[PDB]
């Protein structure tokens, strides 16, 4: 498509400009989908192997992490899709979503690691 | 603007975002600029995004 | 477990309305469906034993 | 609008939210008003959202 860096975004009211990539607003969802189905099959296995008390019942923690990640992604995809007009707000919400996903992954899977110290 | 007769003129602002070419015409030079105090004008407009200058995106940085 | 699920649902829905609060013309319409989704989440949390039986 | 000549005038469309005034200049009702072409009536008092309306209401009330 393009390396990016689409400068001088033309707004309806020519007051201020904002720097952005070429088409990082609607094309990224495609790549996002490339992971979503993955996550899908992943949580599918998380539902298939949820009854496994092995590794201090690590299958339940895997399933919980999958549930939280799938919920936050199902909530983040339409938000990132409908907020493509604004730049600062869209970047802020996608950044908050990414940070929340990373934090819930580090807090749900590494919960027994922190508990046993 | 020049009326039918060519001995008077009406002083009206055509557009605030339009380049000031002549004393009778009014048309923009480029796109995404503002006429500055210089003679050329309709230019000198950098990107309106400060690098870590606004306290509105400190949330992502601290998280 | 259901309380933790409801809490993470709250923590996921909070930024959704926090970012959708802009352009309140659609926020006044999404408020109803957000409250309905929250009520449905609480209903599931409460009736998981009722749904199992 | 009246040019430098008193003989005739110049036809220029002003802002649309202005009322149907005389041939001097189109008059406005102020912020938050919309006149008509019948008697220059600027009331524009609609409702916010009708109960059980077909626009973003049927789905919510049904769910």
Curated annotation (Swiss-Prot), chain C:
The chain crosses the membrane at residues 1-20, 31-53. It is found in: Cell membrane; Synapse; Cell projection, Dendrite. Residues 21-30 are extracellular. Detected in brain cortex (at protein level). Widely expressed in different regions of the adult brain as well as in fetal brain. Dimeric G protein-coupled receptor which is activated by the excitatory neurotransmitter L-glutamate. Plays critical roles in modulating synaptic transmission and neuronal excitability. Upon activation by glutamate, inhibits presynaptic calcium channels, reducing further glutamate release and dampening excitatory signaling. Mechanistically, ligand binding causes a conformation change that triggers signaling via guanine nucleotide-binding proteins (G proteins) and modulates the activity of down-stream effectors, such as adenylate cyclase. Forms heterodimers with GRM3 or GRM4. Interacts with TAMALIN. Interacts with HTR2A. (Microbial infection) Interacts with H5N6 virus protein HA. Belongs to the G-protein coupled receptor 3 family. This is Metabotropic glutamate receptor 2. The gene is GRM2.
């Amino acid at each position: 498509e393009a390396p990016g860096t689409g400068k001088e975004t033309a707004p309806e009211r020519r007051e201020v400009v904002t720097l952005r990539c070429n088409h990082r607003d609607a094309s990224m969802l495609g790549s996002l989908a490339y992971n979503v189905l993955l996550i899908a099959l992943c949580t599918l296995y998380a539902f298939k192997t949820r009854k496994c008390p092995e590794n201090f019942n690590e299958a339940k923690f895997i399933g919980f992490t999958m549930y939280t990640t799938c919920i936050i992604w199902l909530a983040f995809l339409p938000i990132f899709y409908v907020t493509s007009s604004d730049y600062r707000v869209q970047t802020t919400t996608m950044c908050v979503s990414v940070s929340l996903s990373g934090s819930v992954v580090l807090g749900c899977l590494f919960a027994p690691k922190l508990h046993i110290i | 603007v020049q009326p039918g007769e060519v001995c008077c003129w009406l002083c009206i602002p055509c557009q605030p975002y339009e380049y000031r070419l002549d004393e009778f015409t009014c048309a923009d030079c480029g796109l995404g600029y503002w006429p500055n105090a210089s003679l050329t004008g309709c230019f000198e407009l950098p990107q309106e995004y400060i690098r870590w200058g606004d306290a509105w995106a400190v949330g992502p940085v601290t998280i």
